[PDB]
Ligand binder design. Structure first.
Ligand SMILES: NC(=O)c1ccc[n+]([C@@H]2O[C@H](COP(=O)([O-])OP(=O)(O)OC[C@H]3O[C@@H](n4cnc5c(N)ncnc54)[C@H](OP(=O)(O)O)[C@@H]3O)[C@@H](O)[C@H]2O)c1
Ligand SMILES: NC(=O)c1ccc[n+]([C@@H]2O[C@H](COP(=O)([O-])OP(=O)(O)OC[C@H]3O[C@@H](n4cnc5c(N)ncnc54)[C@H](OP(=O)(O)O)[C@@H]3O)[C@@H](O)[C@H]2O)c1
Lengths: 374, 374
């Protein structure tokens, strides 16, 4: 539980200048502090450079990276940091690597929590929740204790939704609206599938939203989606497909992707992550929206409270967001969303011992983790 | 030796629109055709998305990717292309994957030839040159036969320098000035090292040039380099270091990098590659320069002709370049450059059977391949 223990910089990033705003590069904004857990993993190995290049926050936004890793993968983190220095990225004003959350999360304005333990060979969902839940329970206290009171936290380590509930549950000082579960890779994969069916390039499909858990209970919402400007429903008139098939296509994208030999969707996920961050740092296009697993309290859809449930949101580009109100539902959608909700509330109970609710009671389906995920 | 055999597109990229310049996105330039060999490898897995994101050619430059792979790694290429489609990159107007150079290199304006066979466990340099030389001999004929008469070719597969000589030697219709050997990762690594020693951030070091082969005979030129605006020589006054140590630090960067467990400098190399391309597509900053293994004919330094020797160049950002004339040399520099030249001319002879010169005569040192390279 550190205090006074500040994070040490990394070679060259220690030799950095004053602060962009007054001598050279006065065009640059004030530096943004970004923390990344799972910093030595594959998604990170992609994400990091996209951040450093200004692809994420812009070309006039000097960045500071605080890479949180783990004992075992420390050599790896040193390596990534070594690649970071040989990249000569001007925006990357400073980087620091370490294994202590209370040190690394120190002053973080964005906490991109990718990284959690992989599903064991014969591991039951409940324990998958327990193990990673603990990691996130801890990172939550750290964030709470030593991070910017308005840290925008973005969770990608599975089970992301619950992992996020836990994180905010252990980080009371931090606004729960700030915690996001990454369902965006799912959104992108779904646009691609709706473009593929309709015979249009993915840049013509929009208003795609994902509801529920980042698991096989999520719902690639085709009812409110649009292609070219008109509801998907009246472009892909094959209604049976949309209901009986669409979902399973997005739901297995990663699974087929992995068949093209063993690599995870690192590059794509790395991309989803930046698109995710941008949807909060950039004003949502007129009439469109993005998907994010966020806290349910305040939602107008009727979804249960006290959980992290992905839903349509729009932003003015300030880090915050608001739920999208102009949306419709039917028997299909309504029942599918409610079915994911059931799952989530069960994980919640199964994770009562890491959320501060009480004794855990697990009754979960060991078949829901998305194909292709580590 | 295809003709009439055109490259088929890939799912979603087949459903693409007209051509940016007249309906929507009239701000966009005319599409650029980019071919990538070794498309399913690690450096590519990084490079590709940087290209697609517009990081390389700009945000108003729609791109077309022609990914050349190999039979064995075809499943992998399908996978990368699958990640490409789930990324929803607007600039990535079209992509096509395949294993035939005469098909894939069809109409290429940029041929980023990363990818060649790795050094065998007990493989002698000569054969390393032979094996990869053949690949490049073939890709050269293809490029020559079916590519844009002004293809800018950028070789990264080792032995890059010779591999490039061979490529242009088998591609007579294509201007030899167009072939580039990637010595940029080396340049970047060296700036980082000169920044580290002088106690300044890498953004204060400039005019670093690399001469010779992309091997342990190259010369991280500290004599013409500058820090803050004044020659490195009068900032890092520890002259013995610059001569006796500097070189070995850059020369082993990859070697130490790999010690931080088994991953190649994929992310960094991916970065060097884009910096390389930009130095040709962007006007070189006033007084600075970049390093590139290019054809020697016309050089004013005294370096031997008919080889690919990295040297200082500047560009107006049109794809072409010119050698930098305002540069000095001393006993140290002069002798070191000449020693790399010796190597190169020996590889040249060792590769006479792939260059159209005659019977090969190999007499090479089996210790020169840079630490950390596959
Ligand atoms: N939401 C999505 O769509 C999505 C997509 C892909 C993956 N995921 C999920 O995210 C998790 C892993 O992501 P991945 O596939 O990218 O794996 P990965 O790149 O291989 O990274 C896994 C990480 O676990 C890390 N680790 C263990 N304990 C940690 C802790 N105390 N703090 C920080 N890092 C810790 C390791 O740390 P080091 O960094 O030190 O190695 C390692 O990097 C999985 O549960 C996976 O299912 C979600
Ligand atoms: N200049 C530099 O500083 C630098 C830096 C790093 C590496 N390199 C050199 O580049 C070469 C490999 O790069 P790497 O480390 O990035 O390896 P990598 O990512 O693992 O890729 C190696 C590739 O060899 C490919 N291949 C074999 N025959 C091919 C052909 N007919 N056409 C197209 N691709 C072919 C494979 O094809 P698939 O794409 O189908 O798998 C594979 O991707 C090595 O010789 C290495 O030393 C140079």
């Amino acid at each position: 539980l550190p205090a006074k223990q500040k994070p040490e910089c990394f070679g060259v990033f220690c030799l950095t200048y004053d602060l962009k705003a007054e001598e050279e590069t006065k065009s640059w904004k004030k530096i943004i502090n970004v923390a990344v857990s799972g910093a030595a993993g594959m998604i990170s190995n992609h994400l990091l450079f996209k951040l450093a290049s200004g692809e994420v926050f812009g070309p006039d936004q000097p960045i500071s990276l605080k890479l949180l890793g783990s004992e075992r993968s420390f050599a790896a983190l040193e390596g990534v940091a070594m690649e970071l220095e040989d990249s000569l990225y001007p925006l990357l004003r400073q980087v620091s690597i370490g294994i202590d959350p209370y040190e690394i999360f120190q002053d973080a304005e964005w906490a991109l929590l990718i990284g959690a333990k992989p599903r064991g060979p014969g591991m039951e969902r409940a324990d998958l929740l327990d193990i990673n839940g603990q990691i996130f329970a801890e990172q939550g206290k750290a964030l709470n204790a030593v991070a910017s009171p308005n840290v925008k936290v973005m969770v990608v380590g599975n089970p992301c939704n619950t992992n996020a509930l836990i994180c905010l549950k252990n980080a009371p000082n931090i606004p729960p609206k700030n915690f996001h579960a990454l369902t965006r890779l799912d959104e992108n994969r779904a646009k691609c599938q709706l473009a593929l069916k309709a015979g249009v390039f993915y840049d013509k499909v929009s208003n795609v939203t994902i509801w529920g858990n980042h698991s096989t209970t999520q719902v690639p919402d085709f009812l409110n989606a649009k292609i070219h400007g008109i509801p998907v429903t009246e472009v892909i008139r094959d209604r049976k497909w949309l209901e009986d098939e669409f979902t399973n296509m997005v739901q297995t994208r990663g699974g087929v992707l992995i068949k093209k030999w063993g690599r995870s969707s690192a590059a794509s996920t790395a991309v989803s992550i930046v698109d995710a961050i941008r949807s909060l740092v950039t004003p949502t296009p007129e009439g469109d929206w993005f998907s994010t697993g966020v806290y349910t309290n305040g939602n107008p859809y009727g979804i249960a409270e006290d959980i992290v449930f992905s839903m349509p949101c729009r932003s003015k580009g300030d880090g915050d967001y608001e739920f999208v109100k102009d949306v419709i539902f039917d028997d299909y959608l309504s029942k599918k969303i409610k079915k994911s909700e059931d799952e989530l509330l069960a994980e919640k109970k199964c994770v009562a011992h890491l959320t501060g609710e009480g004794i855990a009671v697990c009754d979960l389906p060991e078949d829901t983790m998305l194909p292709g995920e580590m």
